[PDB]
Motif scaffolding. Structure first.
Motif, mmCIF file in Angstrom:
data_model
loop_
_atom_site.group_PDB
_atom_site.id
_atom_site.type_symbol
_atom_site.label_atom_id
_atom_site.label_comp_id
_atom_site.label_asym_id
_atom_site.label_seq_id
_atom_site.Cartn_x
_atom_site.Cartn_y
_atom_site.Cartn_z
ATOM 1 N N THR A 54 42.010 11.434 18.870
ATOM 2 C CA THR A 54 42.692 12.680 19.262
ATOM 3 C C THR A 54 41.871 13.925 18.925
ATOM 4 O O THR A 54 41.803 14.852 19.737
ATOM 5 C CB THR A 54 44.082 12.759 18.614
ATOM 6 O OG1 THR A 54 44.879 11.710 19.139
ATOM 7 C CG2 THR A 54 44.794 14.073 18.886
ATOM 8 N N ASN A 58 38.464 13.897 18.384
ATOM 9 C CA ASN A 58 37.046 13.764 18.767
ATOM 10 C C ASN A 58 36.639 14.965 19.648
ATOM 11 O O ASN A 58 37.405 15.378 20.527
ATOM 12 C CB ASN A 58 36.750 12.431 19.462
ATOM 13 C CG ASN A 58 36.446 11.296 18.490
ATOM 14 O OD1 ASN A 58 36.315 11.500 17.270
ATOM 15 N ND2 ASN A 58 36.298 10.071 18.999
ATOM 16 N N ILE A 68 36.774 17.959 18.735
ATOM 17 C CA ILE A 68 37.713 19.072 18.508
ATOM 18 C C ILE A 68 37.392 19.904 17.278
ATOM 19 O O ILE A 68 37.188 19.375 16.199
ATOM 20 C CB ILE A 68 39.214 18.613 18.473
ATOM 21 C CG1 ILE A 68 39.644 17.877 19.762
ATOM 22 C CG2 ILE A 68 40.181 19.771 18.164
ATOM 23 C CD1 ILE A 68 39.608 18.716 21.010
ATOM 24 N N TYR A 82 34.424 10.255 28.945
ATOM 25 C CA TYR A 82 35.317 10.947 29.855
ATOM 26 C C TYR A 82 35.514 12.392 29.350
ATOM 27 O O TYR A 82 35.329 13.345 30.114
ATOM 28 C CB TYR A 82 36.665 10.197 29.917
ATOM 29 C CG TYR A 82 37.756 10.966 30.622
ATOM 30 C CD1 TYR A 82 37.780 11.064 32.002
ATOM 31 C CD2 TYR A 82 38.784 11.568 29.908
ATOM 32 C CE1 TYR A 82 38.802 11.738 32.659
ATOM 33 C CE2 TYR A 82 39.818 12.239 30.555
ATOM 34 C CZ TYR A 82 39.817 12.329 31.930
ATOM 35 O OH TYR A 82 40.807 13.012 32.578
ATOM 36 N N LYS A 83 35.817 12.551 28.042
ATOM 37 C CA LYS A 83 35.997 13.876 27.463
ATOM 38 C C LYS A 83 34.694 14.691 27.510
ATOM 39 O O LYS A 83 34.715 15.902 27.746
ATOM 40 C CB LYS A 83 36.491 13.772 26.014
ATOM 41 C CG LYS A 83 37.856 13.134 25.870
ATOM 42 C CD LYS A 83 38.141 12.890 24.423
ATOM 43 C CE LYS A 83 39.538 12.370 24.198
ATOM 44 N NZ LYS A 83 39.767 12.151 22.761
ATOM 45 N N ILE A 90 34.239 16.076 31.030
ATOM 46 C CA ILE A 90 35.185 17.183 31.223
ATOM 47 C C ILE A 90 34.617 18.467 30.574
ATOM 48 O O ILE A 90 34.622 19.532 31.198
ATOM 49 C CB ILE A 90 36.584 16.862 30.617
ATOM 50 C CG1 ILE A 90 37.265 15.641 31.305
ATOM 51 C CG2 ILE A 90 37.515 18.114 30.602
ATOM 52 C CD1 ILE A 90 37.746 15.906 32.671
ATOM 53 N N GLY A 91 34.121 18.351 29.343
ATOM 54 C CA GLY A 91 33.539 19.492 28.654
ATOM 55 C C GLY A 91 32.292 20.022 29.338
ATOM 56 O O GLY A 91 32.074 21.240 29.392
ATOM 57 N N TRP A 125 33.884 20.229 22.144
ATOM 58 C CA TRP A 125 33.734 19.905 23.570
ATOM 59 C C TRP A 125 33.229 21.084 24.378
ATOM 60 O O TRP A 125 32.569 20.878 25.386
ATOM 61 C CB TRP A 125 35.050 19.357 24.178
ATOM 62 C CG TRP A 125 36.190 20.341 24.212
ATOM 63 C CD1 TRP A 125 37.142 20.531 23.250
ATOM 64 C CD2 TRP A 125 36.468 21.298 25.243
ATOM 65 N NE1 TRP A 125 38.000 21.538 23.622
ATOM 66 C CE2 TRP A 125 37.632 22.004 24.857
ATOM 67 C CE3 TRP A 125 35.881 21.595 26.480
ATOM 68 C CZ2 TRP A 125 38.197 23.007 25.651
ATOM 69 C CZ3 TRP A 125 36.428 22.603 27.246
ATOM 70 C CH2 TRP A 125 37.575 23.294 26.832
HETATM 71 C C1 I8A Z 1 38.975 19.794 27.157
HETATM 72 C C2 I8A Z 1 39.477 18.919 26.017
HETATM 73 C C3 I8A Z 1 39.750 19.766 24.782
HETATM 74 C C4 I8A Z 1 40.804 18.189 26.465
HETATM 75 N N1 I8A Z 1 40.038 16.968 26.190
HETATM 76 C C5 I8A Z 1 40.515 15.686 26.325
HETATM 77 O O1 I8A Z 1 40.177 15.010 27.295
HETATM 78 N N2 I8A Z 1 41.415 15.200 25.456
HETATM 79 C C6 I8A Z 1 41.578 15.660 24.081
HETATM 80 C C7 I8A Z 1 42.984 16.135 23.863
HETATM 81 C C8 I8A Z 1 43.325 16.813 22.581
HETATM 82 C C9 I8A Z 1 43.835 15.439 22.858
HETATM 83 C C10 I8A Z 1 38.730 17.515 25.785
HETATM 84 C C11 I8A Z 1 37.587 17.207 26.745
HETATM 85 C C12 I8A Z 1 38.302 17.143 24.370
#
Ligand code: I8A
Ligand code: I8A
Ligand code: CL
Ligand code: CL
Ligand code: CL
Lengths: 697, 695
Positions: B194, B196, B198, B313-314, B317-318, B650
């Protein structure tokens, strides 16, 4: 704690407000014997707050406050909800049926009068001291014979305050010709939509514009083509000076309810019964609903509004329970009552300790009943759609047992069936929700406390909830359209009397009403003990830093423009900007679509005189004012009384503020007036509205 | 903004001093003497570590030492969930296949490599980037038998700046590295998946090892006679903490960056690599999550597979957020246009020709690369039955000697590994139906792996029926179907097996795409050598750092938070109060260790809390880090250890292409929190006593 103060309390708060930054003279904000800024505040459509902003009766309120009027005037050809509405002339302003604006003309302390009338006690346990019927009889007696006829448009109302220790008479002036003047598109008016409900930072342009109309003499009159805009006693000047961190801010409005004098046992009850049940039951309901909506795009269309409606009080209960758990609400109520009890013991007056004991005893005694009531209300009455399926009336059942009255009874039953099984109703989704909701309900409520029909789960279906629910739909007349039609062709009383869905709906509503009737008597000893409890608190610490509970009457609150830290290492500032709207833009998410005219304004920086000194375009700000439901649309004022914004929400961290104000977390979420004027100007292009307002540099 | 070569310290020193550095240049890096660089190690081939005592104690991340903690864990002594604290040196646990690498010497060998390359002849030769060729040059320069004359030592030559600079590294490797200490996983991995990538972050991501060696401190494999290493340099631990704007620096081994991508390569990374990984993994994860939430047994079997898919995947997105909002493409276009204008002015057209060759190669491989990412994300990693057993040529030439049983036993072992305790054929069928539906919509019939052509030809476009048939008729469709095959095996059954044909077909197409795409890398690499040579000749090597390549680099910056979005500020430091706010007893990721919760309640923070009385946990800094920097020592202006790098937010993952000053941060565990956990949770006082802790 911070306070929702009576207008009468302005005198004794004035010096504190001045020390916190207030610059206006006391009587310019509120004068009981003259015109003041209070005269520009209205109760908008029985719930919301509004404010007069021009000498021609222009009124600002929230977009969510004027939403129904914008929707009622919207068609496929002119969708005002989606595109906004901007009447380019006064004659183009749209009238609204069933609308009202209420001005608070006069406010009078009538405590001695009401208390003298109450001394004619037939029963010391009488609840007449809180009865709207009794208090209205006293209001009419004081106002005079035929006051409504002698003063058309005016009305008088007496309300109890401080649990019946103070009474005020309000003289109200009501206008019912209130026309829609302007509204931004929904993409601005409700930008965050449900995702950002109770959220700070906030980027929502939550405003709409109306105009009060009246007869030739400015007197209230229902809709008439001969009505002329109202020339009001007072209107707000609009400030373009903006806001800075630590600036003084104040609000006037109509907060609905607070529970500032709850005992510690009432806080425990609110947490362990009200909130825990609503949280648990709605999470089960929402979880099934969301799984079905994500699997079928047609289910998402039918259930989005039902899902959103359930989430609103669910989020509130989560926020309230967070305050109970982390902000010491129970402990602070316990300290408040223990301090009164110790003081009572020194004064030789045991009635305050006896009052707190009566409240604790009543709370402890009603525990099982209240738990059963919340369980059935959250679990079934709200939780399961087929609980509100048709129940044939005594006259409808009598009509089916020899005359043309049979076809009339069937047509009435059909109309109710068609409303239950409408275009948004899925019997499959409802069966899945009912199975999960009843499984939880059956685990909490013992057999002897079950609504009679639910006893069949254990007795007839061997504990199989799925089979019980399947049988309700397979055998019921309301299980499908083809089953209703087969019934409607050959209707019999005996078919309805044994219908599994009718028996379920009747049984759960019988138990819901029985619980309500058994619980209602417990409110009275608590209310009577609260009159003694609050009298003691006032005698001990004064009506100085203990505000009366909100009761849908006009109050003021003051504070500062200030952000807060929601959690470790995170700070939310006091102001959001148009850049934050652009960061949130998501073209394929209806909630976060950005209006093309607004996006172009941002790109060209066409902010005029509405931008802040750094060239950034402000959107919203937050303040330490103490607000609650009823304060939507409230005018937010400067130290000079000039309009700087409209209150439209409060952050979830501060929802516990209805019981205990939270200085470090609770904030009013306000749309910056500079953003309102930017939208009227650069999005609506409605220059005439800007010209009729008194805008101060 | 950069990941600098140790050689570049001289040229950066004055800027570092203006930014706050107090230590002398040669105390940090000395090319001919002992320096702080000598206390930095490459931990287990990927991570970074650091020596923190005169007895070879090493600190790294908990996620870096995770495999060693897990390999020593049993039901009776579960070190992964309980933590491990050896109360004596003899109790430290040895680890098989572990290593620590010291960078003994670094030498610029550019002139040497470039002179050796002049005898190639073929102008398009890739020997200038070949590890085999460069190793031949490294051995030639080191000597006939360097490793015998200098045991424990080895040499390596690496290319930098796309082949414009070469460095030779003399490495000292130790393979006896023992587990000394580790916090429980509730501390070492508090946020778990959760949190990672962050920030804010509340994870005490550390583990403790010890380097062992022979009696003379020379490298030696595991032996009960090995003695802890006395290193030439170790870090002093600071207890002065950090403040906003404090100078911070890191040494470590960043793996890869793409700082010299053209604008066309940024577009390709977005539109192909990232968009396909995002779309395909969201489909895969969505089905997996629905199934895990509906069945607690599916949640147990698929949690690790789900978590493994979410990590990149995350990242994607970042990275796509940076491409969309931080102008990465535009800044690469401005960089190449500036070089092109400068080359037009000097009469040297080779730089514009190099950028054109890169653009043309990217445009030409577009459809092939799209097909490769589609099959890799969609099927190779998307569908578990793609990695189902494929009978070898040897196994077919056995079922039709009586080693028919030997062939069946090898096929059975592979079947049992595919259909293991964590495999659900039902979940896999649901994932395959959603993944193949997307794949079949994106890849035309003529580009499909041969077996997928049956969806339209035999199953009338019904993906569900095609997938149902694969399991109903395959010998790997269930245990009972495998056993019926194993009792009466034939090569004709395997040759027509729908699962074998699917797996063979998708792997054939995946290898064919790879083979056709691989030749496109070479003209890009050759054009990058010319492109980067021009950028260096034009603007110099001092702002333009060489791409990361798993070699030792330094980066400097400040302890500083950032604003992630409008009206939101994340400060530079998290505290133990933030761990307590996040506690959720019925969520395994956010459980709080009872000994840690008690320390917080009693405020038993000793000398580790700040001046306010609040216990720090983690901090963030404007240093430029990437994968490979996990476990890196974070230093003060005085070179004292103030933390360990363990992650990056991210918002800064696009920093591998373009550093993001306003968003990119290194996420670091505060050394004070590390010492509080060793002391008050582990109660391992001997580790505190052997460290040199400075007030
Ligand atoms: C743009 C984000 C902050 C949203 N995300 C995720 O895919 N999931 C993490 C969420 C916090 C549980 C990142 C790429 C880290
Ligand atoms: C903290 C809250 C009281 C507000 N809330 C929400 O669900 N808001 C949804 C937003 C998008 C994430 C609870 C968790 C109930
Ligand atoms: Cl008394
Ligand atoms: Cl607070
Ligand atoms: Cl050494």
């Amino acid at each position: 704690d911070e306070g929702m103060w009576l207008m009468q309390q302005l005198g004794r708060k004035y010096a504190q407000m001045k020390e916190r930054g207030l610059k206006m003279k006391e009587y310019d904000l509120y004068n009981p014997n003259g015109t003041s800024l209070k005269d520009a505040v209205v109760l908008f459509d029985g719930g919301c707050t509004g404010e007069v902003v021009s000498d021609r009766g222009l009124v600002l309120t929230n977009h969510h406050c004027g939403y129904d009027m914008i929707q009622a005037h919207s068609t496929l050809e002119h969708n005002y909800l989606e595109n906004g509405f901007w009447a380019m002339r006064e004659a183009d302003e749209l009238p609204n049926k069933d609308i009202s604006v209420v001005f608070i003309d006069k406010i009078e302390d009538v405590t001695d009068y009401v208390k003298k009338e109450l001394k004619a006690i037939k029963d010391p346990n009488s609840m007449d001291y809180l009865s709207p019927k009794y208090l209205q009889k006293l209001a009419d007696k004081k106002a005079g014979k035929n006051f409504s006829a002698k003063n058309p448009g005016l009305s008088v109302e007496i309300k109890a305050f401080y649990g019946g220790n103070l009474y005020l008479m309000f003289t109200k002036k009501t206008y019912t010709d209130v026309r829609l003047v302007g509204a931004p598109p929904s993409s601005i008016g409700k930008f965050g939509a449900d995702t950002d409900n109770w959220i700070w930072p906030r980027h929502t342009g939550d405003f709409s514009i109306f105009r009060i109309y009246a007869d030739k003499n400015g007197n209230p009159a229902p809709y008439s083509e001969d009505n002329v805009p109202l020339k009001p006693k007072r209107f707000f000047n609009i400030s373009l000076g903006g806001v800075q961190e630590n600036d003084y801010a104040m609000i006037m409005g109509f907060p609905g309810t607070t529970h500032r004098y709850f005992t510690a046992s009432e806080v425990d009850e609110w947490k362990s019964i009200d909130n825990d049940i609503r949280i648990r039951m709605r999470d089960i309901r929402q979880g099934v609903m969301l799984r079905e909506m994500l699997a079928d795009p047609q289910i998402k269309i039918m259930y989005s509004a039902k899902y959103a409606a359930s989430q609103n009080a669910y989020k509130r209960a989560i926020g309230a329970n967070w305050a109970i758990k982390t902000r010491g609400l129970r402990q602070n109520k316990q300290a408040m009552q223990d301090r009164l009890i110790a003081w009572g013991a020194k004064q030789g007056t045991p009635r305050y300790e006896e009052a707190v004991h009566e409240i604790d005893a009543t709370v402890a005694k009603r525990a099982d009943l209240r738990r059963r009531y919340w369980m059935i209300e959250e679990g079934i009455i709200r939780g399961i759609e087929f609980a509100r399926s048709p129940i044939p009336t005594e006259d409808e059942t009598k009509a089916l047992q020899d005359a043309s009255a049979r076809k009339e009874a069937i047509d009435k039953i059909r109309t109710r069936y068609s409303k239950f099984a409408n275009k948004d109703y899925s019997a499959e989704v409802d069966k899945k929700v009912a199975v999960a909701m009843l499984t939880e309900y059956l685990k909490e409520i013992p057999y002897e406390n079950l609504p009679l029909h639910l006893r069949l789960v254990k007795d007839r279906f061997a504990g199989d909830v799925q089979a019980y629910v399947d049988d309700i739909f397979a055998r019921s007349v309301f299980g499908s359209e083809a089953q209703f039609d087969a019934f409607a062709a050959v209707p019999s009383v005996e078919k309805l009397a044994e219908d599994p869905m009718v028996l379920f709906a009747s049984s759960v509503f019988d138990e819901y009403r029985k619980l309500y009737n058994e619980l209602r008597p417990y409110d009275d000893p608590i209310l009577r003990a609260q009159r003694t409890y609050i009298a003691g608190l006032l005698e001990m610490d004064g009506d100085q830093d203990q505000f009366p509970d909100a009761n849908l009457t006009l109050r003021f609150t003051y504070g500062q423009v200030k952000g807060y830290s929601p959690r470790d290492n995170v700070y939310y500032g006091h102001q959001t900007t148009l850049d934050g709207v652009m960061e949130k833009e998501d073209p394929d998410n209806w909630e976060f679509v950005v209006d093309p005219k607004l996006k172009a304004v941002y790109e060209r920086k066409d902010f005029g005189r509405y931008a802040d000194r750094s060239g950034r375009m402000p959107v919203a700000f937050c303040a330490t004012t103490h607000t609650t439901g009823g304060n939507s649309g409230s005018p937010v004022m400067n130290a000079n009384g000039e309009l700087i914004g409209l209150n439209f929400d409060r952050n979830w961290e501060g929802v516990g503020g209805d019981i205990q104000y939270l200085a470090d977390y609770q904030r009013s979420i306000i749309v910056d007036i500079r953003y309102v004027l930017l939208v009227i100007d650069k999005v609506g292009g409605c220059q005439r509205l800007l010209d009729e307002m008194n805008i101060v540099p």
